[PDB]
C-alpha cells in the first residue's frame, strides 16, 4: 500500500486512528481514552465529535496534519470489494491484511454486540493468532481499497471472531 | 515472543526460511553463484541438498538458537489452504491464502517449473493492490496450521503474469 497511506495511521488510545485530511481523524469509539480532554494539543472545546456506534470522527478547527491532502472517505464499500486493513506491528513491521467485504451485519463477539460491514480475511484457512490475523490492539486500523487511480478509506477495525476468519469494519 | 515472520530472511535475489536453528530452505534460482560464506559461516562447513527449485542448507552450528524446530513436509494434501509468507523490501508483511493442487510440471511465463500448483484466494487480478506476488518474492515459505502444529511444505518458485497461478517447490 502507498507510503502516504501508512503516514496517516497514528497510534491512539488502546489502538489506532487515521487522518482523512489535515483536519479530519477517524477511529473506533472503544479505543478512545474515556478521561481524555485534549487531543493533538487542542482542547475538546475546539473539536467537532461525530459518533455513530463504533465509528467516531474528529474535525479540528486548525490543520493538525498540513503535510497531508484530503482523500475520499466512503460509507463502507460494495459487497465483494477486496480491501487491505493497514495494521502496524512490533518492529516498524507493516501488515496490510487482505479482506473480502460482505454485508452490513449485527453480531455478538466475545459477549459484546457489534454493528458494521462484515468481511472474511484472505490470509489463510483459519486466521487465529497474530501471524495471519488481527489482535485486540489493531482496533481503529483503516480499511482501504484502490479504484482506477484513486485510493479510498471506507471504515475502521472494530472487532474479529475467536476463529479469527470474520472481521467487522465500523462505517460512517 | 516467537513469530513465524522472524524465520523469513532476505537471501540472494529473494528470501529464505529458518526451519530450525541449523536448517534454512530457499528457492534454488535466488542463491548467489559466487560465495565463500553465508550468515558468517564458511561454505566449507554447510551441507547443500538441492532438488530442482528446492534447496536445503544444514549448518554445522546454531545460527538461530532463538528458534525451535518446525515440521517440514513434501507439499500438502490437495485442497489445503496454505499461507505464502511474503516479505517486501518496503517493510510490509503480506500473508496470502493459496488453495493447493497437484504436483506437476507447469509452463509459467517462458518456462517449465516442477512443484505443487496453487491458486490465490484474492483471484480477481492480483497486480495493482497488495493481492499477488512479484518476481522478488521467490523463496517465501508455504505454511499451514494442522492441529496445534505449524507445517512448512515448500518455497515460492514461480507465478503467472496473472490469472491466479503459483508454484511451490517441494523437498524430494
Ligand atoms: C499531537 S502532537 O502535538 O504531538 N503533534 C501534532 C501533529 C501530529 C499529529 C498526529 C501525528 C503526527 C503529528
Author numbering:
A (entry chain A): 1 to 172
B (entry chain B): 2 to 173
From the paper:
Viral replication requires a 3C-like cysteine protease (3CLpro) which processes the 200 kDa viral polyprotein into six functional proteins. The 3C-like protease (3CLpro) was named because of its similarity to the picornavirus 3C protease. It is a cysteine protease which shows a typical chymotrypsin-like fold containing two domains: a β-barrel domain and a β-sheet domain separated by a groove where the active site is located. The active site is characterised by a catalytic dyad (Cys139-His30) or triad (Cys139-His30-Glu54) and shows a strong preference for a –D/E-F/Y-X-L-Q-G-P- (X can be H, Q, or E) sequence corresponding to the subsites S5-S4-S3-S2-S1-S1′-S2′. The key role of norovirus 3CLpro in the processing of the polyprotein and the absence of homologues in the human host make it an excellent target for antiviral drug discovery.
Fragment J12 is the worst in terms of resolution, diffracting to approximately 2.1 Å, although the electron density is still of good quality. Screening with the DSPL library and part of the Maybridge Ro3 library identified 19 ligands in total which bind in five different sites, as illustrated in Fig. 2.
